[PDB]
Design a protein around this nucleic acid. Structure first.
Lengths: 56, 110, 46
RNA sequence: GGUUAAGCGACUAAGCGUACACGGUGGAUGCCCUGGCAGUCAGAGGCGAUGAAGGACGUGCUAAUCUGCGAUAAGCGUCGG
RNA sequence: CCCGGCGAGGGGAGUGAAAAAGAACCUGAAACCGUGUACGUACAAGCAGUGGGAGCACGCUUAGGCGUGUGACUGCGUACC
RNA sequence: GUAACGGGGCUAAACCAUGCACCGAAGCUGCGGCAGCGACGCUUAUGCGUUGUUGGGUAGGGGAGCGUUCUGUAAGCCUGCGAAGGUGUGCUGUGAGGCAUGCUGGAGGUAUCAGAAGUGCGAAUGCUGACAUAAGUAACGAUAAAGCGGGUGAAAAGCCCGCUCGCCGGAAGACCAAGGGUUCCUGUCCAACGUUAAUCGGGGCAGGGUGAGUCGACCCCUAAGGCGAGGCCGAAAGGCGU
RNA sequence: GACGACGUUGAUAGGCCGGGUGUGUAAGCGCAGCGAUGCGUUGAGCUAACCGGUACUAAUGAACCGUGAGGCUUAACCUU
């Protein structure tokens, strides 16, 4: 139920070798507005594939 | 030239912040801002403000060029902890530690 | 669950009040001890 | 120089270890004493119904606490410095 | 004066012998947690050291075949009270 | 799980007899060094020429030393041309240690020979403070339930407004005593507090709010019981009671 | 996590169209009856995950990672 010995700081680091985050590879650019956005997502101004979807 | 920005006594554990800090070490400031903008972490908001402050300091206090800036050094240090009490069952009491951290960002044109 | 402390102002003063302590020789000695120690609140009067 | 075969063989570090450099956390050490401790030589050995010891509430150009004071309320008269 | 939410927290300027004395403030040790550099480590089994010892990096040096850090491989080796 | 040579293996690398080599310990020898105890040269206020011999060690006995704080020597000596303390490096002694010096620090330190002790820490499920581990793991407190539009804002699943949905309804509605004591209303703020965010709050700060001849208390009367002038009783304190 | 299919030169998912299956004669209207009900229109209406089809909606042009002929020695071969 509980440990018999204190784990070392090296073992702690090994367990955390899979905790690193992954950054986004790249961002898409809209044809008309020309701002960066997540792929398959609308832009901040309210654009998607140069169609000007609802902004409000 | 090297410019420094700091955020001391930030309400976040050092371990959590270090996850976001490792994503922008050695990257260009323009690319670093993009990475932080699309990271769903609370520490990302804190780090982004410090990075922006460092860029402003170089532009104003040193007359540097934004396009030439780059994140050369970034590290997070543990700060003072706040002690609290959390009641448990059968009259037992436990100690709660609210951890803080210091965030340092260095931007240079080299 | 009913607990041991059930407050009641009237019973508090009649049991540990200033006049209750002054009505007996032993009670008066309690005040003398607390006066010597320097207690800011001699009794539970208020 | 080319082809094939056989034998041999560096450059990787997701992480970790040791050494050094530079930091964070933390408040040890050194230095410091308007606080304590133990005595010596002299004082005074009692206060109170002319209201005591100890308290409550008030009192300032004054919101709070401390000190002083008591509706004459951080003070009044008189004699000296 | 500048970034920021007329924030928090910082970077300049100025004061001072000193701001790495900035009010979380003299000196600022250890446990503990980080960034950078050199070397070792992903076919090898156990109190983690000790004796032997290659290679690599660096500082010297009239190359003087030395010093410092690291430690592939190998003999022996089951903490303290 | 081979498991009755340690193993590989061996027809000698097994056994018996004889002989000659070699390996093998901190044992013995060789070279350098230190110390104890003996006798010798009457050496000397003793070290040697020498000279032999000894030196594992618990309980325990004997002998000799290191360092720390304080007092005298000291109205001396060192020190802002940088003291104590902190952190490295080099040298040095048989050991506890000592000396010099770079950086940090910014005002005290102290020879020699004597004197006095709150004089040396790894352990006592020792005491106090600080910081690790498990671990970014368990958990976030009744399974009555939420969905969308607009507003405010640096930021809205949680705040405000609106339309639906769901739950209690002999309560999860309304009014009081006891108890608490400003939690009440308005403006303003978001560090800490709220088990998340927060513009919101029983949170921070400032101002405002409690109006009685008839309600309650006080007041008049007494129950259980308490106290009790004299009194009765008891070493004192004190007990009972008109 | 992984593994398989597909991304407009497209049937991957939803919707839509047809069918099947399940339930068992919808609503409205008309007729009979004082009425509850019954009968006709009618095996009607509705129908999840299934079968066969269909680009109506969503699967965007890009960007990113991964390179540029691949060590030494020896023998046999090219030039048995």
């Amino acid at each position: 139920a509980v440990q018999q010995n204190k784990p070392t700081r090296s073992k702690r680091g090994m367990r955390r070798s899979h905790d690193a985050l992954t950054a986004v590879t790249s961002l898409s650019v809209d044809k008309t507005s020309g701002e960066k956005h997540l792929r398959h997502h609308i832009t901040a101004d309210g654009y998607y594939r140069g169609r000007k979807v609802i902004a409000k | 030239m090297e410019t420094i920005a700091k955020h001391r006594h930030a309400r976040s554990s050092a371990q959590k912040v270090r996850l976001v800090a490792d994503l922008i070490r050695g990257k260009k400031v323009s690319q670093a801002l993009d990475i932080l903008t699309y990271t769903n972490k609370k520490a990302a908001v804190l780090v982004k403000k410090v990075l922006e402050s460092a860029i402003a300091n170089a532009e104003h206090n040193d007359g540097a060029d934004i396009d030439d800036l780059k994140v050369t050094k970034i590290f997070v240090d543990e700060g003072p902890s706040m002690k609290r009490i959390m009641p448990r069952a059968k009259g037992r009491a436990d100690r709660i530690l609210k951890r803080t951290s210091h965030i340092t960002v260095v931007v240079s044109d080299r | 669950m009913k607990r041991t402390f059930q407050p009641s102002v009237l019973k508090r003063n009649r049991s540990h009040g200033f006049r209750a302590r002054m009505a007996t020789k032993n009670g008066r000695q309690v005040l003398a001890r607390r006066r010597a120690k320097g207690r800011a609140r001699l009794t539970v009067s208020k």
